[PDB]
């Protein structure tokens, strides 16, 4: 494609503690981030103001989620409960809806399947599917070999992949709840999980600089995007709406961008004085966001 | 621009709240509490009450402490502790009453060396080697009711000394405090525990104060 280095249009200040969570809604205009000061903050790259700042019951929150209709937000963390907050309330302020308890494992990824279902995955080697109406695990995903902390959904809302940091990369199903596909062959624990916009590809990001992608239909290792001289790890990974761009967040105080087939660096997002732990691209495909541990959020457009 | 100005002013109002909330968080001191299986990590938290991470709050000499337990959480400890970087003091609790066991019921290691395999690991990972590692010596009272019985030679073969509290106490520091390959920045605050006295929380305040002072001294090239 080219050497698109970086473009820091704006910087979202205000955060004070480290950030391990960042998600974008379907409107391509709102951003949600979490921090260790017990203050979950919703942003928007169009105006750069704090639209909502809902305090967090657990300061150790490590994940975020935005509802497709922009009406709910979720948090996880080392507290084992998913505190669902309804943004649209008659009282106006953001309040908790239901606390999803019964995990007994650290929480680091709970994506919003829809306005009613949650695909909360915990660190007790088991995932779960939640229901807002009853607040109970509709499905009891089990069969992993290690703790899983990063998931990614699909536009059709009919499939998701749960990848633990033990070269598991198990592909589950929303309804039947069994491992339909499994990918193995990774040499290190994984920490970043993403899904293709088309819904027929799946990539992982591990703590070995070996960001690789696989295929849903055929279980084999595609291009591994071999690093040149990078020895650090990867914390977050995301796919642009174009589908011909790979973006990953590395531990060496910077980010790198590759191509679908070139598998070569196409730009460095080094603008943060700490390791990057968040990454996300808008559903439309305009502008990119990055969260890190220096309590600074920036938008790359 | 009436709504845009109000929306912009809303962020400024929230920013003021963040500064007020951040100021309280800034002066609040974070405490990491950890231990082995029934190693006295639950006995300490019951001391400073009147005066899967659980969190307890107490005030001692204009300081807002906050413990973050680990016994109730069972996961890959060595890879989620990165979130605890920046914690001022890490309280490690080991009871001097379990230096023997029939294997480990999960591996081949007594509790004493297993605890020493966690104290060394927690002070060697590249996340906590900046401030200090506070150590607590639990089961101090019951230690005497086992030192005149079967000695420390069961756990420590190289033990060569007397069979009293004075000789034993000096050894305990060597077993735990001398577990740092780096001593330029990290320090171990070894001090015993009182079963029914308030001196346990007194050691918390000054030790946390000492590392706080050294943290400022270490910065700006003054220590």
């Amino acid at each position, epitope marked *: 494609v080219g050497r698109i280095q970086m473009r820091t249009r704006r910087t979202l200040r205000g955060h004070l503690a480290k950030i391990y969570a960042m998600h974008w809604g379907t409107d391509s205009r709102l951003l949600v981030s979490a921090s260790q000061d017990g203050k979950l903050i919703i942003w928007d790259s169009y105006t750069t103001n704090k639209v909502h700042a809902i305090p967090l019951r657990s300061s150790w929150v490590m994940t975020c989620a935005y509802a497709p209709s922009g009406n709910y937000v979720a948090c996880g963390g080392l507290d084992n409960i998913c505190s669902i907050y309804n943004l649209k309330t008659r009282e106006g302020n953001v309040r908790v809806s239901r606390e999803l308890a019964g995990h007994t494992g650290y929480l680091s990824c709970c994506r919003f399947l829809d306005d009613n279902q949650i695909v909360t995955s915990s660190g007790d080697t088991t995932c779960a599917l939640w229901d807002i109406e009853t607040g109970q695990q509709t499905t009891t995903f089990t069969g992993h070999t290690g703790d899983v902390m990063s998931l990614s959904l699909a536009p059709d809302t009919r499939l998701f992949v749960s990848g633990a940091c033990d070269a598991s990369a198990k592909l589950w199903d929303v309804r039947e709840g069994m491992c339909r596909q499994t990918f193995t062959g990774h040499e290190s624990d994984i920490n970043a999980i993403c899904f293709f916009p088309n819904g027929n590809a799946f990539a992982t990001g591990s703590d070995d600089a070996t960001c690789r992608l696989f295929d849903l239909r055929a279980d084999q290792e595609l291009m591994t995007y071999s690093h040149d001289n990078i020895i650090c790890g990867i914390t977050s990974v995301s796919f642009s709406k174009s589908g011909r761009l790979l973006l990953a967040g590395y531990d060496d105080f910077n980010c790198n961008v590759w191509d679908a087939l070139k598998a070569d660096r196409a730009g460095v997002l080094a603008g943060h004085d700490n390791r990057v732990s968040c990454l996300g691209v808008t559903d439309d495909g305009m502008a990119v966001a990055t969260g890190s541990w220096d309590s600074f959020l920036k938008i790359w457009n | 621009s009436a709504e845009d100005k109000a929306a912009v*002013e809303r962020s400024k109002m929230i920013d003021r709240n963040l500064r007020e909330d951040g100021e309280k968080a800034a002066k609040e001191v974070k405490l990491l509490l950890l231990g082995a299986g029934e190693s006295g990590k639950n006995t300490i938290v019951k001391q400073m009450k009147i005066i899967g991470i659980v969190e307890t709050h107490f005030t001692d000499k204009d300081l807002y402490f906050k413990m973050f337990d680990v016994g109730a959480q069972r996961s890959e400890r060595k890879k989620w502790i990165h979130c605890f970087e920046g914690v001022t003091a890490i309280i490690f609790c080991v009871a001097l009453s379990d230096y023997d066991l029939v294997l480990a019921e999960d591996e081949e290691m007594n509790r004493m060396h297993a605890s020493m395999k966690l104290f060394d690991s927690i002070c060697n990972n590249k996340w906590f080697t900046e401030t200090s590692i506070i150590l607590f010596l639990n089961k101090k009272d019951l230690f005497e009711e086992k030192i005149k019985r079967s000695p420390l030679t069961i756990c420590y073969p190289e033990y060569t000394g007397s069979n009293t509290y004075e000789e034993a106490a000096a050894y305990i520091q060597c077993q735990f405090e001398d577990l740092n390959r780096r001593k330029d920045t990290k320090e171990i605050y070894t001090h015993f525990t009182c079963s029914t006295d308030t001196k346990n929380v007194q050691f918390v305040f000054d030790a946390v104060t000492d590392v706080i002072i050294k943290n400022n001294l270490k910065e700006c090239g003054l220590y």
Partner: single-chain antibody
Amino acid sequence: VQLVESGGGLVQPGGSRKLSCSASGFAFSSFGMHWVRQAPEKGLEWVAYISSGSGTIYYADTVKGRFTISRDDPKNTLFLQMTSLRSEDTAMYYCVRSIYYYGSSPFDFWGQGTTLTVSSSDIVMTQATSSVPVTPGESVSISCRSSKSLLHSNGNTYLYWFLQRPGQSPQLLIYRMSNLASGVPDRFSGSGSGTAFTLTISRLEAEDVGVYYCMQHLEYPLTFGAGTKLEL
């Protein structure tokens, strides 16, 4: 969640009387408070506005020292501090709840208000064709004027749509950019290119008789329709 007006009214001619509406069941801390005033026969017009934290003290074009606003946020209530009297004060004062952010719906819930009888640049936006006597099922259409464009370069039109049942507080139908608000039922819509807006309600039914408003929100001075007179 429930606002009712009290404090007095019609105490004596020529005597100042400050009034305040009681509020309940919401934060109010992050909520804008308006004092939009209704004419004795037809027309609900805005005179005061305060935002969160009392930062914004926007007043109406009829600027006077007697018109003041005070945010009773600690009490969740509000203050007016009326001074002197005038023939224009014979009116119907209401209370307004509003919040300002992306995706928000300002002017959602309005109180019942009270009647205050007194004895001895702007879009204006008045519904010119406010007389169409039609039976239910006729797909009523109401058109409001606009002096200039209401799009402040943000891609959305800062126009609010209302519905006032007889003897009841006004209810907003669709907020800016022609989107549903306040949880009101469906079939409430309407939009236009520029400086020309229309009402599109199909599958017409009852419980919609009264007066309709057309509000602009481009800048500090707000305005509404003089009055719509469409009945069954």
